[PDB]
Design a protein around this ligand. Structure first.
Ligand SMILES: Cc1cccc2cccc(Cn3c(C(=O)O)cc4ccccc43)c12
Ligand SMILES: [Zn+2]
Length: 226
């Protein structure tokens, strides 16, 4: 998160910190969010050979009783995820066991309604990602308030599509999701409407988020079958 504030500790109890293993490089990291006691939503580009989820974290360098470190038993990457266009950048992770509900850990289920969210309003995103181009991932959970933009603001992303994705962050400010915030929720009036996907390497906003409303049928189909 660039240009944000430190979250109040444990104030976003659905937030998940993902450690991503690959066979041919060191660990990588993403965010995500708990939508059922045994399911985390994140970005498809966060897939790996194996993943471990930490729930209940604030400072990810300091072990505490709120932590739950949980094994992922299976990854459900969207079957149409495209590494060229980056369309359909969404994935569900099934946890080996259901998480414990505490003050610091809880779900964020979708409401019944799945209305298309138009441009104009302010929403908020949280993550442990980099705080600038030359800066390392934050030890503490950070968050920032960003403007939903008209889709023409994201035209320069030549594979951007308004039906599939949200355009997020006023270009006149530095405030943005960035590298390492991958997979985190964009909440608009307390409802998850987006998932951090991608942006510019130089961190100039806006960035591109997956539009959750488009994928609600797919999300439901995985949950009901598993
Ligand atoms: C999340 C994010 C936000 C803003 C700007 C970004 C600029 C570049 C990449 C990312 C995230 N990202 C990464 C990575 O290296 O972090 C690899 C990758 C592959 C497919 C899709 C997204 C991807 C950005
Ligand atoms: Zn604590």
């Amino acid at each position: 998160i660039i240009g944000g504030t430190e979250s109040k500790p444990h104030s976003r109890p659905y937030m998940a910190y993902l450690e991503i293993v690959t066979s041919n490089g060191p660990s990588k990291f993403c965010g995500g969010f708990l939508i059922r006691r045994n399911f985390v939503l994140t970005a498809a580009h966060c897939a790996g050979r194996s993943i471990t989820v930490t729930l209940g974290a604030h400072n990810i360098t300091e072990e505490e009783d709120t932590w739950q470190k949980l094994e992922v038993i299976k990854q459900f990457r969207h079957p149409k995820y495209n590494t060229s266009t980056l369309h359909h950048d969404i994935m569900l992770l099934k946890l080996k066991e259901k998480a414990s509900l505490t003050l610091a850990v809880g779900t964020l289920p979708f409401p019944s309604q799945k209305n298309f969210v138009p441009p104009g309003r302010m929403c908020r995103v949280a993550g442990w990602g980099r705080t600038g181009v030359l800066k390392p991932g934050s030890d503490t959970l950070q968050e920032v308030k960003l403007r939903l933009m008209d889709p023409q603001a994201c035209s320069h992303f030549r594979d951007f599509d308004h039906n599939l994705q949200l355009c997020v962050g006023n270009p006149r400010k530095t405030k943005s999701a960035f590298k390492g915030d991958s997979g985190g929720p964009l909440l608009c009036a307390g409802v998850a409407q987006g998932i951090v996907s991608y942006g510019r390497s130089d961190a100039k906003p806006p960035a591109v988020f997956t539009r959750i409303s488009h994928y609600r049928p797919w999300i439901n189909q995985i949950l009901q079958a598993n």
